[PDB]
Amino acid sequence: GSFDEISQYIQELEEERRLTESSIRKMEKEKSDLNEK
Amino acid sequence: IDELTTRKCSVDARLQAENERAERQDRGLKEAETTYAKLVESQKTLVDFVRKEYEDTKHQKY
């Protein structure tokens, strides 16, 4: 039973990992916007 | 320019901090997804002696 519950939360955490990357890439674009101005 | 520099520092501070915060969880999940293979063997192992306990009773029936 613990095999599936732990693995399911890993995917949710891995989903958050992609979400963090999206914010990171957007922050670089926001940084580029600040650089241009 | 100070407002933009403060904005640049605010963005850059979060930018690098989020990268470290994300990579520490990402590399931890790389071991966690490998632990899923261990959990696959764990599920295999736990059910194995459960059937052995059944087999501990089953061969007694013979």
Numbering used by the authors:
A (entry chain C): 7 to 43
B (entry chain D): 44 to 105
Provide the publication's sentences verbatim.
SSNA1 is a fibrillar protein involved in dynamic microtubule remodeling, including nucleation, co-polymerization, and microtubule branching. Although SSNA1 is only a small 14 kDa protein mostly comprised of a coiled-coil domain, it grows into long fibrils through a self-assembly process. In vitro studies have characterized SSNA1 as a microtubule-binding protein that facilitates the nucleation of microtubules. Although its precise role has been enigmatic, SSNA1 is essential for cell integrity, and it is highly conserved across eukaryotic species from algae to humans.
Cryo-EM analysis of SSNA-1(3E) revealed the presence of 8 parallel fibrils assembled into filaments with C8 symmetry with a periodicity of 112 Å, which was also validated by the averaged power spectrum of the aligned filaments. The outer and inner diameters of the filaments were 90 Å and 55 Å, respectively. Within each fibril of the filament, individual protomers were arranged in double-stranded coiled-coils and longitudinally connected to adjacent coiled-coil units via triple-stranded helical junctions. Our model building revealed that the coiled-coil within each protomer unit (CC1-a1 and CC1-a2) assembles in an antiparallel manner, spanning residues 9-105, unlike the previous publications following a conventional assumption that the coiled-coil running in parallel with little structural information. Interestingly, the C-terminal helix of each protomer unit forms an overhang and reaches into the adjacent double-stranded helical arrangement creating a triple-stranded junction. The overhanging C-terminus of the first coiled-coil (CC1-a1) forms a triple-stranded helix with two alpha helices of the second coiled-coil (CC2). The electrostatic surface potential analysis of the 3E mutant shows the presence of negatively charged patches, primarily attributed to the specific 3E mutations (R18E/R20E/Q98E) and the neighbouring charged residues within the three-stranded junctions. While residues R18E and R20E were oriented towards the inner lumen, residue Q98E was located at the interfilamentous interfaces.
